Structure formats: C-alpha cells, structure tokens
Amino acid sequence: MAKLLIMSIVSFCFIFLLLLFFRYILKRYFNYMLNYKVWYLTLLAGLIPFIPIKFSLIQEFATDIHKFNWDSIDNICTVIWIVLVIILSFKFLKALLYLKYLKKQSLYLNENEKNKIDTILFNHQYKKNIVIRKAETIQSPITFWYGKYIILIPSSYFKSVIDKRLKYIILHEYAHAKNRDTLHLIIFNIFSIIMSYNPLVHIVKRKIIHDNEVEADRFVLNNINKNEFKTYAESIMDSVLNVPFFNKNILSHSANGKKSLLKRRLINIKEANLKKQSKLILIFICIFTFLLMVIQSQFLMGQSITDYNYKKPLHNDYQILDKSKIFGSNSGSFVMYSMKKDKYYIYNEKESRKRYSPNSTYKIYLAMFGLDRHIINDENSRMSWNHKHYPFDAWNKEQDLNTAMQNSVNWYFERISDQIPKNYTATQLKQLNYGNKNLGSYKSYWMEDSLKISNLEQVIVFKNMMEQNNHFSKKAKNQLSSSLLIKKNEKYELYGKTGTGIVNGKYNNGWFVGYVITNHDKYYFATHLSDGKPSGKNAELISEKILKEMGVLNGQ
Amino acid sequence: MAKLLIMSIVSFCFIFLLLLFFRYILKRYFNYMLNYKVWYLTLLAGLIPFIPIKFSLIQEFATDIHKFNWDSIDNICTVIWIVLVIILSFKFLKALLYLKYLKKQSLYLNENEKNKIDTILFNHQYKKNIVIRKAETIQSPITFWYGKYIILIPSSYFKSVIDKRLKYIILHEYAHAKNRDTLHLIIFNIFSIIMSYNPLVHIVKRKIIHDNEVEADRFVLNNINKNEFKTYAESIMDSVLNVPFFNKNILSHSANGKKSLLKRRLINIKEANLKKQSKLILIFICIFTFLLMVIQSQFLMGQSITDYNYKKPLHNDYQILDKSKIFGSNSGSFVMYSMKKDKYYIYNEKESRKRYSPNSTYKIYLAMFGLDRHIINDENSRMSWNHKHYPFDAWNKEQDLNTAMQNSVNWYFERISDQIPKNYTATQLKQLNYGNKNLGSYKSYWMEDSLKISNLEQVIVFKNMMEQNNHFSKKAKNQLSSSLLIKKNEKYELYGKTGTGIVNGKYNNGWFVGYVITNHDKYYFATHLSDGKPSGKNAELISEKILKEMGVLNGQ
Ligand SMILES: [Zn+2]
Ligand SMILES: [Zn+2]
C-alpha cells in the first residue's frame, strides 16, 4: 500500500498545485477565483492509483537476490493509515454528535422572527429549502446540514434586531447554504478521513474553507449597498472580537473560523488575570529543560574528528616516498617501516593516513585473538562447516586456520567472532590502538563496516602486535604468522594478506598488508588502492613490486 | 550530513515538544507562559550533533557486501541545505535592506512629539536606549534593531494624538524593545537560515512571535488601567482592520503580524470590485484541470487485479488433489496435467493459482527464445566467460547450454538476455500467455523480480510452448528439452528444472517445474513450496515423489 498511498499523494499534489497556481493568477490579475468544487479533482486525483484498469495512452545451485525491505514499509503504512482513520473518524463523529445535539435542541422561530429572515432573503427570491432555528446554547451563528441546511442563530440576536447584524449574518450563512458549502465541507471532511494518508487533504479543506468564506463575502457584497461595504467589514470583525473563539465543531461554519493570532491575543486580554508568575517557575523549567538537553547531549552525536583520517602526527622519524609509477593505473597510498631504524617510509602520506575499513585483512586479528583467548588453537585451529553454501566454491568446505586464511573463508571467521567474547576483542582494540577501534554492532564490523584504520596505523598496530603486545601470547603471534607466508629467498620471508573492498559488485578498497622478516632487519607494511581497479590482488602485486624496489625485498 | 541533519531535527523536536508541553500546562492551569528565551534551547539542541566530542555517560577470493546507498542521500542532503540557505539568506538580506532603507529615511521627532513618548514611558522610568523616529513611508508602526531599538511610527499618528492610540502603540512596541524581541527575533531568524534543514525552525520562530506579542500584551495590561483593557483589545483590532495587511518585512514587528483569514477577507472587501467573472473562465480551467487529471490517469497506477493471483477459472476439466503428506514440512501447492485427457490434477488449487516470480526456472524460456530467434544455437549453444567470479564455484567457467542449465550459471543466462532483442521476448510473453507477462525493467526480470506466474499457469504455458506454439521452431523445443532430463525408466523420461527464491539469505520460493514423456501419455507439471525450507531441491524431491505416487512416474 505504501506505494499507492505515495502515488496518490503525488497525483493529488500535482493537481493541487496546478489549482493553487490558477488560484493565484485568477485573483492576482483578474479578481477571479476558483469555484471550489474544482477541488474535488484533487480528491479524485488521489483516488486514481486504486482503480484497477490497465490504462495507458538438477544440481541445486543458487544465489542471493538483494531486494529492498518493503515489508517494513507497507506493513506499517497500512497500519498508520488505519489507525489514523479510526482517530479521525472518532473526531468526526464527535463533531457530528455535537451537531445532532444542537439539532435536537433547535428552537423554532415565530412570525416576528421568521419575517426578518424573509425580509433579508425575499428580495432575491431565495429558495425555501433552508431551515432557520434559534438557540439558547450558542453565542454566534452555526450552520448544519442534515439535508436541511439549517442556520442556527443565538436567540439573543432576535432581540438585537435593530443593528442589521442579522442582515449580514443571514446573507453570509445563507450564501454558504446556497452553495451547499456545509455539505461539501462535510464531504471533503469525510474524504479527509478516507484519504488521511495525504496531509494535503487538510490543507485543501482549509483552503476551501478560507475561500468559501471569501465567496460568501463576494455574495454579500453582491447583495448589499456599496455604502454598507465598510459596515460589513466592521461587522465581520465584531463577530469575532466580541465573542469567545473556539473550534467547537469542525464541520459547521461560524464567525470564529480559525486558530488566528488575534484569537489567542484577544482571549488573553479577556482573561485579564494580571498575576506575576513566580520566577521559580521558569527557573525550574529552564534548568530542567536544559538538563533534558543535556540528556540529549548524553547521546549519539557525530564528530568531524571521527569522520576524519589520521589527523595525528607520526611520532616516529620518517621519509616521504614517490612510488606513483608503480601504483600506475591503481592510484593509492603505501607505508613501510624499518624495525631496526624505527623509521617509516611513506608514499602519499596524506593518502596513507586515510582510514578505510580493513576488509578481510582484519581476519588475522580476529583469528589471532581467538588463539590468545584459547578459543581457537593449533590442535583445534579448525572450524565445522554448517553445510550452507558460501560466495566462493573455495569456501564450501570445513577448514583449519591455514586453509581458512589462504582462501579467505568468511564462514570460518564468522564463527570465530561468534566464539570469542566480544570484550576480549574490544580490549585488544583498545590496548593496541586499532585505528578508530570502532567495533560497530556487526560481528564482522571490520568487513566493509564500522572499524577503519589507516595504512600508517595498520603498520603501527601489526608491528606493535608482535613487538610490544604484552597481553598476547607468543604462540598466537607465531601461529598466525606462519599462515601468511607469500614468498621467500636468501634475504627474506615475505608474509601478508589481501582483501577486496567489493561493494554492490564494485571495487573500493584494494587491501594488502604484511611484513617481511629478513636476514638483516624486520619490516612492516600496508598498501591500499582506491582508484583504478582497487582489488586485493592488485594491492598484493603493487606492494611486492614496491617493497622490492625499495630494497625491502631486495637486501637494502 | 544527512544523518547529522536528521539527528539535529530529532534533538530539536525533542526539546521543542517538551517546551510545547510546558507551554500548554503553564497557560492551561496557571496562566503562566514560557520565557521565550527558552527556545534558544531548541536551537542549541539542534546544534549538538555537530560538536566533535566523544561524550557519553595469497589466493584472491572475495564476496560482495551489500551496503545502503548513502551517497545518494548525503550528497543531496548537503546540496539541499546549501541551496536553501542561500535562498533564505537572500530573503533575509532583502528584509535587511528594507530596514536599512527605512533607517536612512527615518525622521527625528520634535519636542511636541518626543514629549508624548516620554509621557507614555516616563512613569515606569523606562530606559533611554531606544530610538523614536517617524516616517512618511509607512502606515503602521515598525520596529528595527541596529543596536538602537528603533520604533518607527507613521507621521500621521503625530497628528492623531488625541485618541490614545500612541499609548497603546508605544507601550506595545516598547515592550518588544524592552525585551529585545526584535533582536532575538533576528537572531532566531538568522538561525532559521543556519538550521534551515529543520522546518521546525520556522515553526518555532512563529510560535515565538505569537508569544512575543502575547507577552507584550501582558506588559501592556500591566501598564494600563483595568478599565482600558477593553479599549486596548479594540485598539488591537483597529490596528489591523483599518490598514492594508502585508508582510513587508519578516524581521520587524508590526500590527499585521500574520497571514490570517481575516487578512484575506478584509482586503477583498476593501478591493470591492463587484465584477462577475465569465463562466468560461472556470469552464476552461475546470476542463483543463480535468484533462490534466486525465493526464495523471494516463500514468502508472496500481491494480488489485495485478497484485492478485490467478483469479481466472480453469477452462479445462480438472480434479483436486490431497498431497499434504508429501509436502509435509514444506507446505505449498502442485499442478499436474494429462495431455491425452486434457485434464488437470491440482493440490491446494487456491495456492496453485498463486503467482510467484519463476526464479531460475525461467531460464528455460530465456534460452529457448535465444534458440528460436537464432541468437543461441546448438553449434553455438555456448557463451564466453567474462572472467568475473560468480556466486557458485560451478559458475566460474565458460559453458554450453547443457552445462549452463544443469549448473544454473547465471552469467550464461545474463548474456543471453543481453543478446536477445527484448521485443522477441516480449512477443513470446504475450503469444503464449506468460503469467502476468511482466518484463519489468530488469534484463533478468523473472529472477525474483517483476514477472510472476502461477503453478497452474506454468503448466499451461510450458505445455502450450511445445504443443501449440506456432511461432517457435521444433529444434528450439527439442534442444531445450534434452538439457532438462532428470531420470528415466521403462515407462518414462522425466525432465525438469529447479530454482530457489533465496532473498537476503532466506528461502521464499521452492521451485521445480517440468514434464514427463511416457510410453502411454505426456504430462506437464509445476511445484512450488512456500513454507518450511522452500528450496528448489526440496521442490524437486517433492514433485518426483508426488508424480510417482500419482501414477505419472509409475504407469497410471
Ligand atoms: Zn461563513
Ligand atoms: Zn507587537
């Protein structure tokens, strides 16, 4: 239904706007106005979407189709509309009952009352399918429909019959009757319930009402002497100024037609209670409210700093590199570090400092955490398969840590997160400075989600993981290390891990991280591609090529 | 930014609502009111989200992470805000320039004018950091800030000085000055630009203004005799009734403070041009508008009929079945048909008639269409691989039609849709009654998307595809058929195809379709599971078991 309700709103607003446009033009240039019946077109326009006419002029293998969650939109849209119509229906009925009450309590007029009405309407031979009644229960005129078109006038106006107030009242309310405004109002009012999903129904009923009163004024002017026009306007003002103003009913017409500013102001004057409120009233409210604002300040807010990249300086000595030739077709950034010299070597430092979600490379942390916490071990580095198929054929099997890491088997790693107390992981994120340390709410929060780290930070953290972390065992450090070997020669053993930030089928994060153990030094590094085809494989190739050219993988 | 703008709106509305609540209570029960300065808290509340304080109390394998398209939300939210603030800034400046003009055009008062102001404010020793000016360019009082708090009074009120209008005007505007309302208004006004993303800024400036006028009224009552209270209210009305009403400025205070209904009505009376507009004006507009409504009727609308299942009768003779034992754990529906008898056999007909997207089973139509149209053939039943990895390991290869169909290789089939003129496909959807024949906009529209078909329709269409379709070659019919063989014995050859409606990792459509060629008859069928584990594999198992029990796969 949500789509239909929306389409209805669109249809409605289209027509509605066109009419507003015309309304403007007609008055602005010609002193012309719309015949309000035209507004029925907006209602009709919004009913169009609901008219059912096609009018115009073996091997079991499968993938996951990612559709929008419409159930959570249409189930609620349906309910929202239903509840509201019930509420509005009640409001309507309440108003209806009011009208019925008055109908029951309506009084008949005698010949010395009826003749005033006749005097007023007679000259234009207005129709007799109208009802005039009086009452002791009202302060100012009220119209009613009932197929009768009743004008109920407070009985006091049958005493105050020497100031022409009735002339204006009757012609005014009469005009509404003439044009069946009350009825039409009711019809629209009913439709405002039916079509309550579209707030413009209220907007238009209001505009209609405003204009209905205007047309009535036009009528009255047509029915009065030019030298009484001023009087009429004054009368209109008196009809509101001298009375209490309440929306006692939303169906009938009356002088007090809207929640105006004057309404509020004038009532306050009538209720001239010149009491100075205690200063403490607002001291309390203001501080209370302030504290409630504080409560809002106790809650989630954003920070430009969080959105930002490593804005921090590097505390270590470093050199800036130019490796743009190697990045070539896949622009990015790169960080290398020398353990012996405590020196960093950074390509495009501004970019090196940019934080990206780790993707699959985080799995080394996830797995090694499981190892230290005694969740995952060597004898039991393995995880059971749930027999659910996964994204690569390579993943549809049981596996140990070396296999799981080598083939990036997400299943293996999903279970590892589930099997490790989250607080263990959170503790390590904090202790070893894991980028923004943002664990999100996702068990695999690093997988193109909430946790982000720069290449510089990635190098710092891994290096410290082995070099400094005193809250992590030697076995976990080494067991993990062996699973990452890429290549080796007479100078070194190169270790690392790739991952691809692939989202909605496109590449966004070309990750490759690692370290090198050589026969002269130890190096740490991180590569990230953002442009071209920023895949994990390209990052691997790029990193190796760089490290070799820089002497890391070539003896210098 | 969208998230922040939203958070701001939320923060704002929270506080705002609390204040509205208090406002209600204070007046409703005590005749007390908020000190409008409190509304600064809503502005502050909406600024909170922007405060950057973390306050509270290798083998390359990868999968696709399906994230929400925030770029299309934040890029626009940013622009929307920027454009609007520019517009509002202009509007502000326009208002500012107006005020500057008046400042430049302000006139000084002489001693016989100044003494009136003094008479009015003197008794309460009101401060002199106020400016009184007069002008020939205005009709009613206007306030200005400039750090001066200027009250500009039309020069005519210095002639009409024997009716106490000034008493009320000055005290009223003075009160606004006393409380620095103009300034605060301006500040809020400036913030309504800054925080324009939140429409409540306008709501509150309005509420503030309304209440500012109220506080001024309270002040005035505090500063006048009780027997003048009535006069004051009348004066307020005169200050609007007897003047043109225009929002000449949105910063200054004036008598004509809002776009009221009375405003509109009274102007219309002043402009008492009693011209009957031609009837043709609205005949045109109404019909035009109608035709524009028709234009909306020329457009997309929904149909309950489209949303509905096969509401149609079956034109063929049939028997209703009870196979609930076999469905068992995976409730659904099932249709079988006898070619010799022209009879249908239907389990849960109400459910059999339900339409579901075909999933991978549609591929038989897609492929056979390619065959007839001479896009795909036998010698060239094959399709090249684009070297992109696909959802199953089974799919990461080149393939012919038999392999592609047997392993559901979506890639193969995606290319087939791309290689077949869409009109060929559309023609066949129409000619052979393919369910709702809805081709969507998706090249693979049948894959848990727009095309839907019932099991009954699935049986009818496939049967007719071979039995009746005279716009489709024999080779395409048979080539496709061979690729579907499941099993055979001394009575028959069973053919078919599965597919699984898996969405966001869950099973929704357990499809299996097919036919049986026996040594006595020919049968057609379609199975669909909706409950339990409605997988394509279960559908295959269920269908076979049913067909055998029914005699289809067992000689009867
Ligand atoms: Zn009226
Ligand atoms: Zn004022």
Numbering used by the authors:
A (entry chain A), B (entry chain B): 1 to 57, 87 to 585
The publication says:
BlaR1 and MecR1 are membrane proteins with an N-terminal zinc metalloprotease domain and a C-terminal extracellular β-lactam-binding sensor domain. β-Lactam binding to the extracellular BlaR1 sensor domain regulates BlaI cleavage by the zinc metalloprotease domain in the cytoplasm.
As in S. aureus and E. coli, BlaR1(WT) expressed in L. lactis undergoes spontaneous autocleavage between residues Ser283 and Phe284 (confirmed by Edman N-terminal sequencing), which was mitigated by mutation of Phe284 in the P1′ position to alanine (BlaR1(F284A)). In the BlaR1(F284A) mutant structures, the autocleavage loop is intact; however, in the BlaR1(WT) structure, we detected a mixture of uncleaved and cleaved forms, the latter with the central P1′ Phe284 slightly shifted in position. The F284A mutation results in an unoccupied S1′ pocket and associated movement of Tyr261 on helix α8 towards His201 of the HEXXH motif in b (orange) and c (cyan; dashed line).
